[PDB]
């Protein structure tokens, strides 16, 4: 089973993903709830297969959380709704292996998170562009 750590999903709406990914048979959502410190402490201790991270949260917004998770040996997949500059270019150099819209279903995820396991590069190409 894929290991899934889901950051900040304390929150209702990244709870209810993690929850909808717990369907999958081959899935398994680790460490539900845990934030600040008690999480990076989590990703490196349990060592989840998979990071997910929403980088549209407010007070959170941006790739830091992201970049801050690079050297766990989580693979990271991205959420956001449109492109910024400069995003793509830092996501790469993150080691990020997923780069998704929010707007995909949840199909398009689990496929993800799977070849993501499989040793490939998931970039939705309106993402991988400067801008919207």
């Known amino acids: ?15 209810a993903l993690g929850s909808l990914l717990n369907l999958e048979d081959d899935m398994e959502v680790v460490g539900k709830g845990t934030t600040g410190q008690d999480a990076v402490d989590f990703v490196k201790k349990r060592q989840p297969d998979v990071c997910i991270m ?3 949260m407010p007070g ?42 929010k707007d995909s279903p949840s199909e398009e995820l689990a496929n993800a998170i799977r070849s993501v396991m499989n040793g490939k590069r998931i970039y939705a190409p ?5 801008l919207y």
């Open 1 to 15: 089973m894929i290991s899934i750590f889901i950051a900040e999903d304390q929150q209702m709406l990244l709870g």
């Open 54 to 56: 929403d980088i549209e």
């Open 60 to 101: 959170k917004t941006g790739l830091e959380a992201a970049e801050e998770l690079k050297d766990t040996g989580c693979k990271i997949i991205i959420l956001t709704t449109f492109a910024r500059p400069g995003y793509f270019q830092r996501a790469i150099k993150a080691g990020v292996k997923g780069y998704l819209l």
């Open 126 to 130: 309106e993402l991988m562009e400067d």
